[PDB]
Symmetry: C3
Subunit: 188 residues, 3 copies
């Protein structure tokens, strides 16, 4: 599953290269292991390979990671106790398993230190990835911006990565860069 493992690390590095997530920000991972393995039921092997490759890069930058479980658990997420506390998350009571929750949330639950399940992130993630068309947008804060990365797939699953950036505001006379602001000042 090395390529799953390898492709995972790559995307995480590419992502952070394009979106240098600061310490304390929050990252959300959603994905389907059945999709990662294609048409050949979930896979724990694949699950651990994805995490194996994806998590270190983010953890090294002190970025908090959340792993969304599937719809049978309402998409509650596996997070470290400290992340729930740092982000004011509401804990919900359930324990994931491949058949009820999925292999990726289950493997995350086993690999974390003091995992807890949370109802949602209250849409506070700053960036994240969707592996396999499971959807992760509900977890991201405005404004989500899809990121085209060179790594287009993790196994056979289509990879969708998104960063977030602030809303663009103000009317026809407004500007959006410091450079343009300075020109309006010279003109003034």
């Amino acid at each position: 599953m090395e390529g799953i493992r390898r492709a995972a690390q790559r995307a995480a590095e590419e992502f952070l290269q394009a979106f240098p997530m600061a310490p304390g920000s929050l990252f959300v991972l959603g994905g389907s292991t059945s999709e990662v393995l294609g048409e050949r039921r979930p896979s724990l092997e694949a699950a651990h390979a994805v995490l194996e490759g994806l998590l270190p890069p983010l953890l090294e930058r002190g970025v908090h990671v959340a792993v969304q479980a599937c719809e049978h658990l309402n998409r509650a997420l596996v997070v470290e106790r400290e992340t729930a506390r740092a982000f004011g998350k509401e804990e919900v009571a359930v324990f994931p398993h491949p058949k009820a929750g999925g292999a990726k949330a289950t493997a995350a639950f086993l690999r974390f230190r003091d995992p807890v399940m949370v109802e949602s992130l209250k849409a506070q993630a700053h960036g994240g990835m969707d592996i396999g068309g499971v959807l992760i947008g509900m977890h991201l804060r405005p404004v989500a911006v899809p990121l085209r990365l060179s790594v287009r797939k993790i196994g056979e699953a289509v990879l969708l990565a998104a960063k977030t950036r602030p809303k663009l505001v103000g009317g026809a006379r407004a500007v959006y860069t410091r450079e343009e602001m300075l020109k309006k000042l010279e003109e003034f």
Copy 2:
């Protein structure tokens, strides 16, 4: 009056046995001294507080005391509690005939008390002495606790803790074991 305190201490004792509230959590007390004895009693308020407060405070649990409905159930908390929990302070001073004896006894005993609008449903547990209701202050899901002490004085005691919502459909599981058993398959 010492018996009211003794029932209060046994209640607090049983309550924390079943729900060992951690440092930093919030307990809400609501109650009517009139029901413990329609005239409030500061004496009865002192006994209930002496019985309830020490075991909570020694655990680092924050305490809120709900005033009656004439002050719209605004509660008494230490200024630090209002700060840790992002509570909104309102302007009023309680007295037994408008606030009730217990909010009054708390306001006088607290180091730096403020009246707050509500706790924004943040409490992890509490007690209702006399059926005055405290549910609106508790975070989901409130689980009432059976304690041997069913009354304080002549007032019924309702005690409750809180716990996370149970979620997931028919295949979901709820204990680490059940999970393992599921992995082994």
Copy 3:
């Protein structure tokens, strides 16, 4: 111009006298420099207003937000540390006089690490509105207008407001520690 900074300085001192804001509190400034002048904006008039109002607030550890005009949806300039302390949402834009006003632009130029934020989520404890631009949307309940001796800044009318807790309770309630102790006598032996 010095006349404008002096009226700003008097406004400030008097305001903080009537409402001694604590460190960590939040003050909101809104205004039209064109109104101060008595048309187009002026960075000089902005400069005079900020030099008069900001040193006394900052020395008390009060966080300051400066409201841009409606072309920028009244987003506000605040230090990044303030956006963070008050859980504010950063918005993407750069004010300039013609779009945002001179006051907000001067704040942005002067702050150390400025960011624009969408609103203050009505968390401000007090502020000033110079010229009738409105700042009430930024104040937490209950806003209380203060009458300062300083009524204008330049030609702009000055409106200053503090905030205080909602007064609650029915007919039997009391509102001072004094009234409370008296009510307790009457109950106690």
